[PDB]
Every structure is written in structure tokens, then in C-alpha cells.
């Protein structure tokens, strides 16, 4: 049983363009993009933890990895979304 983000790209796509569809190869490319950025951020977080002799990868690590991995405005929006999601998670 393969693991993919296909269902999640469907759900995210229909939100902005309900009537638009996605081709199979397009879904493959999008999955590869998601996995690539995941690996980039995870590696940078691992390096950040290693440099500070720290054993835990936390939200600060992901935030700094995003600041390092994405360009200016895109990184700003990513940081905003991450902080918002973390806040919504903890608030209860």
C-alpha cells in the first residue's frame, strides 16, 4: 500500500477551484514537491538541533528552517501559517 498526499492535494485544490481537475502526472509532480520540501526542512532542522547540542526538533527548528529554505515573502507567509496552526492546536 503506497503512501501519498493525493487525497490532500485534491482537498486543497477543490478549495480554490472546485471545478478544476488534476492529471495523474501532475499529482505525481505535486507529491514529489511536497516530499522534497519536507526533506529540506527536516534536514535543516536536524542540523540546527545538532549545532546547538540539542536533542529535540521543536517548532523553533521548523520556523528557522523555513526562514532559511524559502525566500522572503513566501517564507513570511509560511511562518504566519505555522504560528497560526500551532496556536490553534494548543488553544483549547
Amino acid at each position: 500500500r503506497k503512501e501519498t498526499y493525493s487525497s490532500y492535494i485534491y482537498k486543497v485544490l477543490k478549495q480554490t477551484h472546485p471545478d478544476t481537475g488534476i492529471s495523474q502526472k501532475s499529482m505525481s509532480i505535486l507529491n514529489s514537491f511536497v516530499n522534497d520540501i519536507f526533506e529540506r526542512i527536516a534536514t535543516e532542522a536536524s542540523k540546527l538541533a545538532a549545532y546547538n547540542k540539542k536533542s529535540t526538533i521543536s517548532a523553533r527548528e521548523i520556523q528557522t528552517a523555513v526562514r532559511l529554505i524559502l525566500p522572503g515573502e513566501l517564507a513570511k507567509h509560511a511562518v504566519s501559517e505555522g504560528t497560526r496552526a500551532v496556536t490553534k492546536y494548543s488553544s483549547s
Binding site: 492529471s23 501532475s26 520540501i37 527536516a42 529535540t56 525566500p71 513566501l74 501559517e81 505555522g82
Partner: protein, 97 residues
């Protein structure tokens, strides 16, 4: 009753899968509670941006679907994604006019 983490954070990407990949991937000895949520929100935002730009690119044409051509056009047209994906080759994407 049970509630998925993505539902608590208000996300569509699976927090659980990302968290499993974070521990199992040999990135660190311990993984914090808030790492998966931040990471998943970031990934979701980037996917949403790709999808919006690609939908616009396909709407420039009359096509009803996104084919690798439109993903290519979306990535190259925008300086942001172009810098981020400066070394990424998209199969069947060709080149801009």
C-alpha cells in the same frame, strides 16, 4: 469520540503521518509536539500556492485540468517559486515562450 490532530489545528494535511515521518526519519533523538503542526502548515501553504498559480496558468488556456505544462508555467513565472525550485526539472514541462 476521537478528533484528528489536523482537525484541531485546522489543516488538511495529515499531522500524524508527518509526525511519524519525523521520528522515523532519523532527524533527531526526540521530536517535539509542535514540530509536526508547524511543518504540516508550511507544506500545506506551499502546496496551496502551487495549486493556485497552476490553476491561473491553466485558466490562461481553456484547459479544465492542470497538466505538467501549467505546473511548469506557474513555477517559472513567479520569482518566488522559481528561486525555490531553481534546480527542479518538471517532466513534460518544457520551457516558457
Amino acid at each position: 469520540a476521537s478528533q484528528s490532530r489536523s482537525a484541531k489545528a485546522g489543516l488538511t494535511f495529515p499531522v500524524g503521518r508527518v509526525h511519524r515521518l519525523l521520528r522515523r526519519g532519523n532527524y533527531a533523538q526526540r521530536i517535539g509536539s509542535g514540530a509536526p503542526v508547524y511543518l504540516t502548515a508550511v507544506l500545506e501553504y506551499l502546496a496551496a500556492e502551487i495549486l493556485e498559480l497552476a490553476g491561473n496558468a491553466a485558466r490562461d488556456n481553456k484547459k479544465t485540468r492542470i497538466i505538467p505544462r501549467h505546473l511548469q508555467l506557474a513555477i517559472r513565472n513567479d520569482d518566488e517559486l522559481n528561486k525555490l525550485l531553481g534546480n527542479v526539472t518538471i517532466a513534460q514541462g518544457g520551457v516558457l515562450p
